[PDB]
Structure 1
Amino acid sequence: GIQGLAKLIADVAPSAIRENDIKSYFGRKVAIDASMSIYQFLIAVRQGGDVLQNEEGETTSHLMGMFYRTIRMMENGIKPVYVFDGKPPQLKSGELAKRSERRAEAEKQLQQAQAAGAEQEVEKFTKRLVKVTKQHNDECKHLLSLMGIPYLDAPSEAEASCAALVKAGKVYAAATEDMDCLTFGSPVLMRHLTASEAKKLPIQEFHLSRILQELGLNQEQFVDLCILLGSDYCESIRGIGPKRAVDLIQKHKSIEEIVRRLDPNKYPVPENWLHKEAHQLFLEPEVLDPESVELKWSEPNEEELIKFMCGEKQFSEERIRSGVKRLSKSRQGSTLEVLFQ
Structure 2
Amino acid sequence: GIQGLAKLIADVAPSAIRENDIKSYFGRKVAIDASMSIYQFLIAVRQGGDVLQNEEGETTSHLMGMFYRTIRMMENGIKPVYVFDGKPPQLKSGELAKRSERRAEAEKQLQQAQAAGAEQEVEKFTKRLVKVTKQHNDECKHLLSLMGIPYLDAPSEAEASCAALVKAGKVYAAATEDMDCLTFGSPVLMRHLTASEAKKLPIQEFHLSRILQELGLNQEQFVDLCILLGSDYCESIRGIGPKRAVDLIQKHKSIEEIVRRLDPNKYPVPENWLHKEAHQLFLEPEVLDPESVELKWSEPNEEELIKFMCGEKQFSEERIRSGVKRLSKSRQGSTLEVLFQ
Q: TM-score, normalised by structure 2?
A: 1.00
Q: Deviations over 1:177-200 (max 9, x none)?
A: 010000000000000000000011
Q: Show the 5 A alignment for 1:1-341.
A: 1-341=1-341
Runs of at least 4 residues off by over 2 Å: none
Question: Residue 144 of structure 2 aligns to a residue in which SS?
Answer: helix
CA distance in 1, matches of 2:200, 2:35: 23
Question: Residue 319 of structure 2 aligns to a residue in which SS?
Answer: helix
CA distance in 1, matches of 2:160, 2:203: 22
CA distance in 2, matches of 1:155, 1:199: 34
CA apart distance, 1:250 = 0.2
CA distance in 2, matches of 1:58, 1:200: 30
CA distance in 2, matches of 1:133, 1:176: 19
CA distance in 1, matches of 2:67, 2:255: 45
CA distance in 1, matches of 2:5, 2:101: 26
CA distance in 1, matches of 2:122, 2:200: 29
Q: TM-score, normalised by structure 1?
A: 1.00
CA apart distance, 1:106 = 0.4
CA distance in 1, matches of 2:313, 2:262: 59
Q: Deviations over 1:267-318 (max 9, x none)?
A: 0000100000000000000000000000000000000000000000000000
CA apart distance, 1:239 = 0.2
CA distance in 1, matches of 2:156, 2:311: 35
Q: Deviations over 1:15-49 (max 9, x none)?
A: 00000000000000000000000000000000000
Question: Residue 43 of structure 1 aligns to a residue in which SS?
Answer: helix
Q: Deviations over 1:143-195 (max 9, x none)?
A: 00000000000000000000000000000000000100000000000000000
CA apart distance, 1:319 = 0.1
Question: Residue 206 of structure 1 aligns to a residue in which SS?
Answer: strand
Question: Residue 265 of structure 2 aligns to a residue in which SS?
Answer: coil
Question: Residue 206 of structure 2 aligns to a residue in which SS?
Answer: strand
CA distance in 2, matches of 1:185, 1:13: 17
Q: Deviations over 1:80-118 (max 9, x none)?
A: 000000000000000000000000000000010010101
CA distance in 2, matches of 1:31, 1:57: 32
CA apart distance, 1:231 = 0.1
CA distance in 1, matches of 2:220, 2:101: 33
CA distance in 2, matches of 1:296, 1:32: 15
Question: Residue 37 of structure 2 aligns to a residue in which SS?
Answer: helix
Q: Deviations over 1:219-244 (max 9, x none)?
A: 00000000000000000000000000
CA apart distance, 1:69 = 0.1
CA distance in 2, matches of 1:56, 1:200: 35
CA distance in 1, matches of 2:149, 2:311: 21
CA distance in 2, matches of 1:5, 1:253: 18
CA distance in 1, matches of 2:31, 2:301: 22
Question: Residue 294 of structure 2 aligns to a residue in which SS?
Answer: coil
CA distance in 1, matches of 2:280, 2:207: 22
CA distance in 2, matches of 1:150, 1:76: 17
Could you tell me which runs of 5 or more consecutive residues in structure 1 were left unpaired when the two chains were aligned.
none
Q: Deviations over 1:46-103 (max 9, x none)?
A: 0000000000000000000000000000000000000000000000000000000000
CA distance in 1, matches of 2:26, 2:184: 27
Q: What's the C-alpha RMSD, in Å, of the aligned pairs?
A: 0.3
CA distance in 2, matches of 1:124, 1:153: 32
CA distance in 2, matches of 1:199, 1:292: 35
CA distance in 1, matches of 2:117, 2:198: 35
CA distance in 2, matches of 1:74, 1:50: 29
CA distance in 2, matches of 1:120, 1:63: 26
CA distance in 1, matches of 2:290, 2:238: 38
Matched pairs, number: 341
Q: Deviations over 1:184-219 (max 9, x none)?
A: 000000000000000111110000000000000000
Q: Deviations over 1:249-277 (max 9, x none)?
A: 00000000000000110100001000000
Question: Residue 35 of structure 2 aligns to a residue in which SS?
Answer: helix
CA distance in 1, matches of 2:111, 2:248: 47
Question: Residue 136 of structure 1 aligns to a residue in which SS?
Answer: helix
